[PDB]
Structures are given as structure tokens and as C-alpha cells.
Amino acid sequence: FPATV
Amino acid sequence: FPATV
Amino acid sequence: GAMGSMERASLIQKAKLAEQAERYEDMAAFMKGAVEKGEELSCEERNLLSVAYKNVVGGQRAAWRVLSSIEQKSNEEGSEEKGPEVREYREKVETELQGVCDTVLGLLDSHLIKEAGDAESRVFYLKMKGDYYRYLAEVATGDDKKRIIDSARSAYQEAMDISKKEMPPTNPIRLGLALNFSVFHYEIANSPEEAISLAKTTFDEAMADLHTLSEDSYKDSTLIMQLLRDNLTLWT
Amino acid sequence: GAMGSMERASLIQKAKLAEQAERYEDMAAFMKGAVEKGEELSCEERNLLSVAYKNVVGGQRAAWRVLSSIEQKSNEEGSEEKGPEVREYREKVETELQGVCDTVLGLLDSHLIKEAGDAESRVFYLKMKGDYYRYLAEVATGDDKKRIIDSARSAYQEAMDISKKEMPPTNPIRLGLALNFSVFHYEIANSPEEAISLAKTTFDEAMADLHTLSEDSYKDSTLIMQLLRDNLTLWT
Ligand SMILES: COC[C@H]1CC[C@@H]2/C1=C\[C@]1(C)C(=C(C(C)C)[C@@H]3CCO[C@@H]31)[C@@H](O[C@H]1O[C@@H]3COC(C)(C)O[C@H]3[C@H](O)[C@H]1O)[C@H](O)[C@@H]2C
Ligand SMILES: COC[C@H]1CC[C@@H]2/C1=C\[C@]1(C)C(=C(C(C)C)[C@@H]3CCO[C@@H]31)[C@@H](O[C@H]1O[C@@H]3COC(C)(C)O[C@H]3[C@H](O)[C@H]1O)[C@H](O)[C@@H]2C
């Protein structure tokens, strides 16, 4: 999964 | 802390 | 609410204690109590609110993905019928996740967003609104799915417009908003080109503004910049 | 109970799903539902029950220790008075932990232990009974503290007596029971010499019985044997 903040 | 199972 | 009898300052103190104890459900309940006191939130308080619910929903999302994967495999050819239990339990976790998203969206709508006038608060809350509609979209399948996606898009877009007018390119809220809106494009909206374009343009404009910053601000901005680069490396 | 309308087999299936999803509170609630169906538990089912509640109470214990440490520091000389909040929140977590221990002890008393006749079930349940009284003892401070400690000791001792009569020295339940009773001696009963003696004698008698085992049984026994050695290395 891609990075989120 | 010591090990428990 | 069960927090209605506790002082606002005590709720904030206990939210920090719960964070230290990795008790994120408690953390979130304390911060909801604080929001329901009706006063605006300071910068530090906004960060406690977002961290609390990000961790709660993050765990629910991880669990939902495990269960959804099991469910999908059980619906492949040659899989032995195992009854309704996998679907039921995935539904149970999904409903609890949706309830948390609705709670957060409720707090933002009553009345955090409407009283947020400074860019750093308004963009922060609208990013959260996009995030929690995005989590609802991740599990949505019915008549309402396109409207959920467009609600996420709309919130992210208003946050984007404000952030570009009112914040420098290296502002960490602006950067994190762009990171997440880029992931929305890739994973939710079936728009990988838009996701890549947004991540690259955001990274490059931030690069060019790093020279204005102190060392401490530099550390904060480059942290999220590396996440943009990580995603671009995953996607290209 | 809220699980009274769900089939026993479905509760067991969902406990396994929750384990896969790292949803240990759910896991524990499903297994309590299964216990309350009134039938004895198989070996695999006993293991699901113990894993579920071990993880739930393990998290509560970790959080309690964080909060207790903060509380202690706030009561040192020169510490600024911060009000009742640290004590209140430590008390909140403590009460929730005590509630989980009481729930497990209730299941063992109604009616798991009384129907457990085979050594592998009776020793297993009496080890759990010692474990959950030990967790109650970790937070106990009042008139009842010595009785809680002796309840832990009594349960562990009955489990020890049965395990020595009915199980080989390498049996994993016997080994884990000895590991934990040794920690009870060191950390709860202020008896470090007894803790060291028990850990060493257990390890040595297991060493001498390894030759009787298959490779798979050898793996299981040596795993817990290494925990005995780890503790002996910590203590000497
Ligand atoms: C609504 O969206 C919130 C996002 C947008 C990007 C990011 C956000 C959140 C937090 C609060 C922040 C950061 C930093 C570390 C990138 C994390 C990203 C995940 O959640 C936290 C904000 O950082 C702040 O709070 C952090 C709390 O955790 C510590 C580690 C104490 O580090 C703290 C930082 O020192 C502090 O500047 C960061 O400024 C902004 C607001
Ligand atoms: C009441 O006390 C329960 C303790 C006593 C020692 C240990 C106990 C528990 C579990 C169930 C067992 C083990 C093994 C790995 C040492 C762990 C110790 C912590 O909890 C689990 C039991 O192991 C069983 O279940 C495990 C579940 O986790 C997997 C990894 C699938 O590995 C499984 C093993 O393959 C299986 O033999 C082990 O036999 C005994 C019963």
C-alpha cells in the first residue's frame, strides 16, 4: 500500500 | 521483564 | 457524552497519557470529549485529535483488509463453501469502521470546520474530511459509492485550493494533504496519472522552497517529501 | 450473552478469523461465547481461549505499567503537582484489566475447571487461573492483596502437582506452567531463590527427556526451554 499521513 | 507464556 | 463531566484540560491531559500508553481508542474518546466542549482547538490539540482517530481507523482498516482477502479467496473457483461467517465478521468490522468515520465526520461538521478560519486549521480539518470519506470509499459498494468518492474529492479539493493560496509549498499540512490526495487519485478515483502528477509537482515545488526554512522546519518538510518520493517510486 | 444466538462452531471459526486480523478483543469475546455453550473445549479451542485473553490483558498490563511509572514520577520530590488525572486514568485502565481477569476467572470457575479431568486440560486451566490471579496481584494494594497472591500460588501449585504426576518433563504445558510459576516467585512472592531453583530444575529435567521426542515435539519443548534459560540469565 502507498504512504499516507 | 521476564518471559512468560 | 460520557466525557461531559470532565474538564476540557483534563481530557487533553488524558489524551496525551493515552497516547503514551498506546491506548488510541481512549485517546480518541478523550479528544472527542474535548471537541464537544465547543471551543476551537489549538494546533497541538488538532494533532492529538488526528493521531487518535488515524490509529483507531488504521487498525480497523488493516483488519478489514485481512478479512476481505479471506472472503475473496473463499469465492474463488474450487474453494470449499465455509458458510456466512467470513462475510458476517468482515461486515462487523466494516460497520464498526464506518461508525468511527461517521463520528469523525460528525465532529468536523459540528462544528470544527465552520469555525476554522485560519488556513492551518481549515486545511487540516478539510484534509481529515477527505481522509475519512476516503476510508468510507475503501469499503463502499452500493448506490452511494460515487457520492462518497465525490465527497472525499470535494473536501480534498477545497483543502488544496486554500493550501495553495495561503501556505508555502513546504508547509507540512500542505504536503501531507497533497500526499493523501495523490493516493486518493491512485487508489480510489482510478486516476494514476493525476496521482503521479500531483506527487511530482508537490515534491518539486517543495524542493525549491526548502532554502527559506530553519533546520527544524527543514526536517519536518523533508520527512513528508520522502513519502511523496516513496510513492512515486512505487508507481513508476 | 450477546453471543448466545451464534452457533458454537461459528464462534470458533470467527475466533480464528479475529486472530488472523489481530482483533484480540473480538477473539476473546467469541471464545467466551464458545465457553458459555457449556461443552468442554478441545485442545485447539483451549489454545484459542488462552491466546485471546493473554493478548487482551497483555496490552492492558503494558498500558498500566506506562501509567504507573508516570504516576510514580509525579510523586517524587520536586515534581510539579499535575492534579488527579494520572491517578484517575491509571485507575480506569486498572479497573478494566481487573474486569478482564475476573471474566476469565469466572469462565474457569463456571465451569471449565470442574469438568476438566484429563491432565492436559486440567493443568492448562489451572495455569490460566494462576496467571490471571497473578495479573490481579500485579495491581493489588489493599486488604485483599495477600489473598490474591495466595490464590495465584494455590492454583499454580495444584497445576504443578498434577503436571509432575501425569505429564512428561518436556510437555509444553508443564514447561510453560513452570516458567510462569517461577516468574510468580520472582516478581510477586519475593522469592527469587525459589524462582531460580524452579527454572533450573525444570530446564534440566526437560533436557534429560528430549531424547524420547520426535523432531516436531522437540521443537515445541526446546522453545519454552529457551525462555527458562533466558530468565535464568536475567536472574544470575
Ligand atoms: C490532518 O492531517 C494531519 C497530518 C498532515 C501532515 C502532518 C499530520 C499529522 C501529524 C500530527 C504530524 C506528523 C509529522 C510527524 C509528519 C505525523 C503525520 C501522522 O500524524 C502526525 C504533524 O507534526 C506535528 O505533530 C507530530 C506528532 O507526532 C510527533 C512524532 C510527536 O511529531 C510531531 C511533530 O513534531 C509536529 O510538528 C505534522 O505537522 C502535520 C500536521
Ligand atoms: C495456559 O497456558 C498456555 C501456554 C502453556 C504453554 C503453551 C501455551 C500457549 C500457546 C497456545 C502455545 C504456544 C507455543 C507457541 C509455545 C504459545 C505460548 C503463548 O500462547 C501460545 C501452545 O502451542 C500450541 O498452540 C500454538 C498457537 O500459536 C502458534 C504459533 C500457532 O503455535 C501453536 C503450537 O503449534 C501449538 O502446539 C503450547 O502447546 C502450550 C499450551
Interface test with D, best of C19, C23, C55, C69 (most D CBs within 10 A): C23
Could you give the number of structural domains in chain C? Answer: 1
User: Is the minimum distance from the CB of C171 to ligand 1 under 6 angstroms?
Assistant: no
**Residue D224 contacts residue D175 (beta carbons within 8 Å):** yes
Domain ranges, residue D189:
8-235
Q: Is D216 a domain residue?
A: yes
C-alpha cell at D20: 488472523
Q: What is the resolution of this structure in A?
A: 1.6
Compute CA D34 distance to the chain's CA centroid, rounded to the nearest angstrom: 19
Q: Where are the beta strands (DSSP E) in chain D?
A: none
Q: Max alpha carbon distance in chain A (Å)?
A: 13
Q: Which residues does D3 contact at the CB level (< 8 Å), separation at least 6?
A: D11, D29, D30, D32, D33, D34, D36
Question: Is C3 inside any structural domain?
Answer: no
Which residue from D99, D108, D219, D234 is spatially nearest to D179, judged by alpha carbons? Answer: D234
Q: How many CB atoms lie within 10 A of CB D147?
A: 12
In a domain, D61, yes or no: yes
Contacts of B5 in chain D (CB under 8 A): 176, 179-180, 224, 227
Distance CA D78, CA D74 (A): 9
* Residue C180 near residue C131 (C-beta atoms within 8 A): yes
Identify how the structure was determined.
X-ray
Is C2 a domain residue?
Answer: no
How would you label C205-216 residue by residue, b for 16+ Cβ within 10 Å and e otherwise?
Answer: bbeeeeeeeeee
CATH number of the domain where residue D39 is located: 1.20.190.20
Residue among C50, C167, C183 whose CB has most ligand 1 atoms within 8 A, to mutate:
C50
The reply to whether D224 falls in a domain is yes
CA Rg, chain A, in Å?
Answer: 5
CB contact, 8 Å: C187 with chain A? yes
- Tell me whether chains B and C touch (3+ CB pairs under 8 A): no
Cα separation of D135 and C30, whole Å?
26
Q: Does C185 touch chain D (CB under 8 A)?
A: no
Residue D110, amino acid: S
For the record, the C-alpha cell of C124 comes out as 487540516
CB of C57 closer than 8 Å to CB of C97: yes
CB pair distance less than 8 Å for D21 and C88: no
Residue D1 lies in a domain: no
Does any domain span residue D2?
no
Q: Is the CB of C48 under 6 A from ligand 1?
A: no
Q: Are the C-beta atoms of residues C44 and C52 closer than 8 Å to each other?
A: no
Is D3 a domain residue? no
Best of C180, C202, C228 to mutate (most A CBs within 10 Å, chain A):
C180
Judged by DSSP in three states, A1 sits in coil
